[PDB]
Amino acid sequence: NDLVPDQWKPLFNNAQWLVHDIVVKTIYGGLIIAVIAHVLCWAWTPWIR
Amino acid sequence: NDLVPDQWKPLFNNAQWLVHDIVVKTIYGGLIIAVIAHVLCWAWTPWIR
Amino acid sequence: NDLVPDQWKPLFNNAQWLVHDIVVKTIYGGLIIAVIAHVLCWAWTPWIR
Amino acid sequence: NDLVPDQWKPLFNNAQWLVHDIVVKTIYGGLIIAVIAHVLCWAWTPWIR
Amino acid sequence: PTLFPEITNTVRGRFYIVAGIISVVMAVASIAIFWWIFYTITPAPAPPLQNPIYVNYTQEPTDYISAESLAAMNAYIQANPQPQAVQVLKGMTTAQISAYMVAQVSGGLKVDCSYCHNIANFAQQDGYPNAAKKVTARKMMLMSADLNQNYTAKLPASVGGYQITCATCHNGKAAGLEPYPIEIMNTLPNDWRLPLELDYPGGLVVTGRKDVSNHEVEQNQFAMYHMNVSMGQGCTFCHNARYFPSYEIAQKNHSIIMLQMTKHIQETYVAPGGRIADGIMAGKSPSCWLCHQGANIPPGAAKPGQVPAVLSSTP
Amino acid sequence: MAPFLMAFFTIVLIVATLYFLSMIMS
Amino acid sequence: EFRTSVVVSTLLGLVMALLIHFVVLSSGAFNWLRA
Amino acid sequence: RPFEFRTSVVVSTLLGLVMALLIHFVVLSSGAFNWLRA
Amino acid sequence: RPFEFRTSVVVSTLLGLVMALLIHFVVLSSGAFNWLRA
Amino acid sequence: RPFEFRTSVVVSTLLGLVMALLIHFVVLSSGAFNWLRA
Amino acid sequence: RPFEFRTSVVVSTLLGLVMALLIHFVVLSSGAFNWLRA
Ligand code: BCL
Ligand code: BCL
Ligand code: BCL
Ligand code: BCL
Ligand code: BCL
Ligand code: BCL
Ligand code: BCL
Ligand code: HEM
Ligand code: HEM
Ligand SMILES: CC(C)=CCC/C(C)=C/C=C/C(C)=C/C=C/C(C)=C/C=C/C=C(C)/C=C/C=C(C)/C=C/C1=C(C)C(=O)CCC1(C)C
Ligand SMILES: CC(C)=CCC\C(C)=C/C=C\C(C)=C\C=C\C(C)=C\C=C\C=C(C)\C=C\C=C(C)\C=C\C1=C(C)C(=O)CCC1(C)C
């Protein structure tokens, strides 16, 4: 677990930290895409009305 | 359990304390977002009338 | 069970006493909120009539 | 069974006596509240008539 | 002086007697006090309606009739004593015609006379904007007479002498009459309607056919549960469930007459060569529920001898 | 006379219970 | 056992309270919750 | 002790949640309040 | 220890998700707000 | 360690997929958007 | 390692196949395209 910050060493393995980084970046990219999709769908047809 | 305050040492592991901190901060953020959402939905359409 | 008062030492563990304190304070807060909610709902629409 | 009166020592443990005291006081409080509720409901709408 | 020293001497055993006694009286007091509360606060089941004209329908909160209308009505009777230009209703004095029109005709629709004619002149046919409603009502009276003489007559007297009238199908609503409401479509498909297309003395027959399968049995079961809801008495009301093809119960024969009658309603009045034109009842195909409403005898059905003779099952 | 009799039989039940429970609780 | 009596009494009381509340509310006798 | 504290906590919390849901649903369905378009 | 932290986390998270779904459903079916053509 | 990372990953991914499917189906069935002839 | 590569492959492939089938069936049943006789 040398790659893990010592704050998260009790929780994250060395390999689990890299997979967690991938998951975090994927969640962030998906969030940006979801925000863009929501803005586009609102400009198209507002659902709240 | 060093990172845990001695008040909560009988209850919280060292790793459980960090996950608890994450859960608490997530609950607080969700509560702020829920309050904002409720104020917006009330300004939009009051459900109590 | 040191933290427990000796009256309740036969019943409460050391960790169970802290969780019981949390439960008691949560019940009290919920009771205050419930009283406020009932007064508001009565001022709004009395159910007993 | 040190805290139990010797009359009820054959029946009540040391911890069971405290829980019994809580149960008795809860039953008494609930009975007072039930009497008040019945008097109020009678003053409101007598069910015997 | 005891024989059960472990039960009457020892505090644990001695206590068990009190425990058992207190638990028995606690359970008895539980049950007794519950049933006491339930029977004292619960109202008596409402007394069954006793109206002279109807089975279990009442018109008598007659607030729906204006005062101006009841005033003009008795004035009209006072001046005009025999009816003027009745086309159906041939054998009735204007007083009896008027009493029937208030009790049954408007009492069945729960509407004022101004719903169908001008209150100044009950007799004028086409002098007001609501004349179309009067011609519709006259055609409905003809339809009622036809249903009474051509389908209610064939039912035995053991059923009763009940006759179809306005409140039988309207039940207090002039328009917006909904056969097949969502209440009776609980486990049926909501699109499902009674299959009045078929020739009914044998239209839903399914047993041992070998040219039908579970799809036709499913249609049959939809129709049969519709009859279950329409007459709350369930499935053995007209069947010996050991053999459904059997006509044991004799309510199955009454139901054949009634199926023919509702098919006749649909073919003659709902959609005579199309419902859009030349058809009364606004394209509302009938159902058993439309008048039975969860009873074996329709609540709005008139008791024997209450409808006019012209509309009666025997004229 | 039915309420009279039901009250009578319940009090006889209770007094019987006090008597023989008094003996058992002796 | 005291625990058994406690469980039985508490459950009986809760069931009774629910039953009586529901009987009283369905009776439409008291003017409670628009009755 | 007669009762584990965890057992009492589970039972009380579940009873409270069930009762809150039941009372909310009874009050909503009563149509006595004009809440959520009633 | 009365309660494993993992157990409380699972129970609280599942209760919150179930309640969010239930409340969303109830509010959407009520037709009391013009959400999603209502 | 209160929670295996693999368990949290499985639960979060399955919850996200189920919620995406549910929300897509609710939005498509609402007919509020004119998507896929709605 | 937290996640066997074979497990991730099985899960991803099955999810992709299920989603392709689901989306194909939703699109074909929608009648929005005029594909396979609309
Ligand atoms: C409105 C008047 C109605 C009626 C409606 C009710 C209703 C409603 C109830 C009763 C109940 C009872 N009624 Mg009644 N009752 C009527 C007529 C009668 C008559 C009579 C001949 O006229 C009698 C003898 C009774 C007799 C009784 C007893 C059986 C009981 C009240 C005392 C009791 O033992 O429980 C005493 C109760 C307690 C000791 C419980 C104490 C519980 C504590 C206080 C907790 C309460 C719950 C609390 C909210 C939880 C909070 C927990 C949080 C974590 C903090 N009723 C009339 C018809 N009756 C009450 C009952 O409980 O039934 C068992 C009840 O529910
Ligand atoms: C829902 C049950 C919750 C719980 C909720 C509470 C609450 C809440 C409290 C306690 C408190 C106590 N609990 Mg605890 N407690 C729980 C589980 C336990 C267990 C267990 C078996 O493990 C035990 C042994 C205990 C033991 C105890 C003692 C440590 C302590 C003192 C009680 C006492 O003396 O009562 C004697 C007192 C009574 C019995 C009074 C009876 C009250 C009746 C109902 C009348 C109420 C009047 C009402 C407030 C007025 C109503 C008016 C309306 C506003 C209109 N709890 C469960 C999880 N516990 C008390 C505390 O710690 O004090 C800080 C307290 O505040
Ligand atoms: C609008 C008025 C309606 C009515 C509607 C309701 C509704 C709605 C409710 C009650 C509930 C209750 N009502 Mg009522 N009530 C009415 C009339 C009455 C009458 C009376 C004779 O008139 C009485 C005596 C009561 C009595 C009561 C008690 C049984 C209870 C409130 C106190 C309680 O014990 O729980 C106190 C509650 C707590 C201690 C729980 C505390 C929980 C904490 C605060 C968490 C809350 C959830 C939170 C959002 C989760 C956040 C977690 C995140 C992770 C951070 N009601 C009228 C008819 N009543 C409330 C109840 O809870 O039922 C059990 C409730 O749900
Ligand atoms: C959903 C449950 C979550 C959780 C969510 C939280 C949250 C959220 C918090 C804690 C916090 C605490 N938790 Mg935790 N906690 C969890 C699991 C646990 C477990 C477990 C068995 O493993 C334990 C032992 C603990 C223990 C603790 C202590 C470490 C700490 C202090 C609590 C306290 O003193 O309460 C005493 C205080 C009370 C009991 C107040 C009661 C509040 C009532 C409900 C009134 C609320 C008023 C409301 C805010 C106003 C409403 C107004 C509306 C806006 C209109 N948690 C689970 C996973 N925990 C607290 C923290 O750490 O502080 C930084 C806190 O903020
Ligand atoms: C529109 C107004 C509607 C209504 C619709 C809703 C809806 C809709 C909801 C609620 C919910 C709630 N409402 Mg409401 N609500 C109304 C009226 C009321 C009233 C009142 C008497 O009038 C009250 C007291 C409440 C009370 C509440 C609480 C029970 C709760 C909000 C706080 C909470 O505990 O969860 C706080 C929530 C959190 C702490 C969760 C935090 C989760 C984090 C932020 C993740 C969110 C999911 C995220 C997208 C996932 C991203 C993961 C990616 C991997 C990054 N509502 C009116 C009728 N209400 C909300 C709820 O959650 O129910 C449990 C909710 O779903
Ligand atoms: C059109 C507008 C509709 C609506 C339709 C949808 C739809 C449709 C969706 C959401 C979803 C969501 N909406 Mg919405 N939404 C609306 C109104 C709202 C409102 C609001 C009060 O108005 C809110 C708060 C939300 C909130 C949300 C969040 C719960 C979520 C988006 C962020 C998220 O957490 O997931 C963020 C998502 C990710 C982090 C996943 C990232 C996945 C990566 C990018 C892979 C994607 C799959 C990819 C194709 C696979 C490729 C693999 C190959 C091997 C390479 N919606 C209106 C009614 N909403 C989205 C969701 O995911 O639900 C969970 C979604 O599916
Ligand atoms: C016609 C347009 C329809 C529609 C119909 C479909 C259909 C149909 C499909 C999708 C699928 C998808 N669509 Mg779509 N889609 C539409 C609108 C959208 C919109 C948008 C908001 O408008 C979005 C964001 C998407 C998004 C997506 C992604 C979820 C996905 C395509 C990339 C993917 O991840 O899988 C990429 C796919 C791969 C990486 C798999 C690669 C497999 C290899 C090539 C083998 C293929 C099988 C091969 C024949 C086997 C040969 C083996 C022999 C042994 C050699 N669609 C409109 C409504 N959509 C596709 C999907 O796969 O769903 C998961 C699909 O099936
Ligand atoms: C009794 C003799 C009788 C009268 C009178 C009557 C009148 C009547 C009117 C005036 C209408 C139209 C109401 C309107 O505002 O549109 C109407 C319509 C329907 N009726 Fe009728 N009707 C009488 C008797 C019966 C009987 C016995 C039946 C049942 C077979 C019946 C049925 C119907 C139906 C169906 C309609 C259509 C209701 C609609 O939705 O508009 N009527 N009737
Ligand atoms: C109970 C819900 C119910 C069942 C089940 C049921 C079955 C059933 C079958 C199988 C037939 C066809 C039998 C055949 O081969 O002759 C059938 C036909 C009729 N039923 Fe029926 N039926 C049920 C309920 C009811 C009820 C409540 C009635 C009467 C109100 C009723 C009546 C009839 C009649 C009449 C027929 C003959 C129809 C035909 O076209 O000949 N059924 N049922
Ligand atoms: C008719 C009507 C309207 C009825 C309604 C009336 C009623 C009765 C309403 C009821 C309200 C109630 C009871 C609401 C309850 C809300 C709760 C319990 C929310 C829970 C939140 C839990 C939360 C946010 C949990 C978050 C969990 C997190 C963040 C997990 C974190 C994580 C875990 C645990 C790990 O592994 C590792 C770390 C990581 C961050 C990944
Ligand atoms: C329909 C009609 C008209 C009905 C009429 C009415 C009737 C019939 C009865 C009425 C009322 C009744 C019976 C009410 C019952 C109320 C109860 C039981 C509330 C419980 C509250 C429990 C509470 C607040 C529990 C809180 C628990 C908490 C905060 C848990 C805390 C925790 C626990 C325990 C842990 O481990 C560690 C995690 C954490 C610290 C979060």
Coordinates of N, CA, C and O and ligand atoms in Angstrom, one line a residue, chain A residues 11-12 20, chain B residues 18-20 22-24 26-28 30, chain H residues 16-17 19-22 24-25 28 35-36, chain I residues 5-6 9-17 19-20 22-23 26-27, chain J residues 2-5 7-8 12, ligand 10:
Chain A
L11 N -7.7 1.7 4.8 CA -8.8 1.4 4.0 C -8.5 0.8 2.7 O -9.2 -0.1 2.2
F12 N -7.5 1.3 2.0 CA -7.2 1.0 0.6 C -5.9 0.2 0.5 O -4.9 0.6 1.0
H20 N -9.8 2.5 -7.4 CA -10.6 3.6 -6.9 C -10.4 4.9 -7.6 O -11.3 5.6 -7.9
Chain B
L18 N -13.0 6.8 9.7 CA -12.9 7.6 8.5 C -14.1 7.4 7.6 O -14.6 8.3 7.0
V19 N -14.6 6.1 7.4 CA -15.8 5.9 6.7 C -17.0 6.6 7.3 O -17.9 7.1 6.7
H20 N -17.0 6.7 8.7 CA -18.1 7.4 9.4 C -18.0 8.9 9.1 O -19.0 9.5 9.0
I22 N -16.9 10.2 6.4 CA -17.4 10.3 5.0 C -18.9 10.3 5.0 O -19.6 11.1 4.3
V23 N -19.5 9.3 5.7 CA -20.9 9.2 5.8 C -21.6 10.4 6.4 O -22.6 10.9 5.9
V24 N -21.0 11.0 7.4 CA -21.5 12.1 8.1 C -21.5 13.3 7.1 O -22.5 14.1 7.0
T26 N -21.4 13.3 3.9 CA -22.3 13.0 2.8 C -23.8 13.3 3.3 O -24.5 13.9 2.5
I27 N -24.1 12.9 4.5 CA -25.4 13.1 5.0 C -25.7 14.6 5.1 O -26.8 15.1 4.8
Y28 N -24.7 15.4 5.6 CA -24.8 16.8 5.7 C -25.0 17.5 4.4 O -25.9 18.4 4.2
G30 N -26.1 16.1 1.6 CA -27.4 15.7 1.1 C -28.6 16.5 1.8 O -29.6 16.8 1.2
Chain H
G16 N -41.3 2.4 15.2 CA -41.4 3.8 14.9 C -41.6 4.1 13.5 O -42.4 4.9 13.0
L17 N -40.7 3.4 12.7 CA -40.8 3.6 11.2 C -42.1 3.1 10.6 O -42.8 3.8 9.8
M19 N -44.9 2.8 12.2 CA -46.0 3.6 12.7 C -46.0 4.9 12.0 O -47.1 5.5 11.7
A20 N -44.9 5.5 11.7 CA -44.8 6.8 11.0 C -45.4 6.6 9.6 O -46.2 7.4 9.1
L21 N -45.0 5.5 8.9 CA -45.5 5.2 7.6 C -47.0 5.0 7.6 O -47.8 5.5 6.8
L22 N -47.5 4.2 8.6 CA -48.9 3.9 8.7 C -49.7 5.2 9.0 O -50.8 5.4 8.4
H24 N -48.8 8.4 8.4 CA -48.8 9.2 7.2 C -49.8 8.7 6.1 O -50.4 9.5 5.5
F25 N -49.9 7.4 5.9 CA -50.7 6.9 4.9 C -52.2 7.1 5.3 O -53.0 7.4 4.4
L28 N -53.0 10.8 4.9 CA -53.0 11.2 3.5 C -54.3 10.7 2.8 O -55.0 11.4 2.2
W35 N -53.4 18.1 1.5 CA -52.0 18.0 1.4 C -51.8 17.0 0.2 O -52.4 16.0 0.1
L36 N -50.9 17.5 -0.7 CA -50.6 16.8 -2.0 C -51.9 16.8 -2.8 O -52.4 15.8 -3.3
Chain I
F5 N -20.6 -1.2 12.7 CA -20.8 0.0 11.9 C -21.3 -0.3 10.5 O -22.1 0.4 9.9
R6 N -20.8 -1.4 9.9 CA -21.2 -1.8 8.6 C -22.7 -2.1 8.5 O -23.4 -1.8 7.6
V9 N -24.6 1.1 8.6 CA -24.5 1.8 7.3 C -25.4 1.1 6.3 O -26.1 1.8 5.5
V10 N -25.4 -0.2 6.2 CA -26.2 -0.9 5.2 C -27.7 -0.5 5.5 O -28.4 -0.2 4.6
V11 N -28.1 -0.6 6.7 CA -29.5 -0.4 7.1 C -29.9 1.0 6.8 O -31.0 1.3 6.1
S12 N -29.1 2.0 7.2 CA -29.5 3.4 7.0 C -29.5 3.7 5.5 O -30.4 4.4 5.0
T13 N -28.5 3.2 4.7 CA -28.5 3.5 3.3 C -29.6 2.9 2.6 O -30.3 3.6 1.7
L14 N -30.0 1.7 2.9 CA -31.1 1.0 2.2 C -32.4 1.7 2.6 O -33.3 1.9 1.8
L15 N -32.6 2.1 3.9 CA -33.8 2.8 4.3 C -33.9 4.1 3.6 O -35.0 4.5 3.1
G16 N -32.8 4.8 3.5 CA -32.8 6.1 2.8 C -33.2 6.0 1.3 O -34.0 6.8 0.8
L17 N -32.6 5.0 0.6 CA -32.9 4.8 -0.8 C -34.4 4.4 -1.0 O -35.1 4.9 -1.8
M19 N -36.8 5.0 1.0 CA -37.7 6.1 1.4 C -37.7 7.2 0.3 O -38.7 7.8 -0.1
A20 N -36.5 7.4 -0.3 CA -36.5 8.4 -1.4 C -37.3 7.9 -2.6 O -38.0 8.7 -3.2
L22 N -39.8 5.8 -2.5 CA -41.3 5.8 -2.1 C -41.8 7.2 -2.2 O -42.9 7.4 -2.7
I23 N -41.1 8.2 -1.6 CA -41.6 9.5 -1.6 C -41.6 10.1 -3.0 O -42.6 10.8 -3.4
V26 N -44.8 8.5 -4.6 CA -46.0 9.1 -4.0 C -46.2 10.5 -4.6 O -47.3 10.9 -4.9
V27 N -45.2 11.3 -4.6 CA -45.3 12.7 -5.1 C -45.6 12.7 -6.6 O -46.4 13.5 -7.0
Chain J
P2 N -14.4 -1.7 7.8 CA -15.8 -2.0 7.8 C -16.4 -2.5 6.5 O -17.2 -3.3 6.5
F3 N -15.8 -2.0 5.4 CA -16.4 -2.4 4.1 C -15.4 -2.8 3.0 O -14.6 -1.9 2.6
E4 N -15.4 -4.0 2.6 CA -14.6 -4.4 1.4 C -14.9 -3.5 0.3 O -16.0 -3.1 0.0
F5 N -13.8 -3.0 -0.4 CA -14.0 -2.1 -1.5 C -14.7 -2.8 -2.6 O -15.5 -2.1 -3.3
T7 N -17.1 -4.9 -2.4 CA -18.6 -4.9 -2.1 C -19.2 -3.5 -2.4 O -20.2 -3.5 -3.0
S8 N -18.5 -2.5 -1.9 CA -19.0 -1.1 -2.2 C -19.1 -0.9 -3.7 O -20.0 -0.3 -4.2
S12 N -22.6 -0.1 -5.5 CA -22.8 1.2 -6.1 C -23.0 1.1 -7.6 O -23.9 1.8 -8.2
Ligands
LIG10 C1 -46.6 9.4 2.4 C2 -45.3 9.9 2.9 C3 -44.8 11.1 2.2 C4 -44.6 9.3 3.8 C5 -43.3 9.8 4.2 C6 -43.2 10.0 5.7 C7 -42.1 9.3 6.3 C8 -42.3 8.2 7.2 C9 -40.8 9.6 5.9 C10 -39.7 8.8 6.3 C11 -38.5 9.4 6.5 C12 -37.4 8.6 6.8 C13 -37.5 7.5 7.8 C14 -36.2 8.9 6.3 C15 -35.0 8.2 6.5 C16 -33.9 8.7 5.8 C17 -32.6 8.0 5.9 C18 -32.5 6.8 6.8 C19 -31.7 8.4 5.1 C20 -30.4 7.7 5.0 C21 -29.3 8.3 4.5 C22 -28.1 7.5 4.4 C23 -27.1 7.8 3.7 C24 -26.9 9.2 3.0 C25 -26.0 6.9 3.6 C26 -24.9 7.2 2.9 C27 -23.9 6.1 2.7 C28 -22.7 6.5 2.2 C29 -22.2 7.8 1.8 C30 -21.7 5.4 2.0 C31 -20.4 5.7 2.0 C32 -19.4 4.7 1.7 C33 -19.4 3.5 2.3 C34 -20.3 3.2 3.5 C35 -18.3 2.6 2.1 O1 -18.5 1.4 2.2 C36 -17.0 3.2 1.9 C37 -17.0 4.7 1.7 C38 -18.2 5.2 1.0 C39 -18.3 6.7 0.9 C40 -18.2 4.6 -0.4

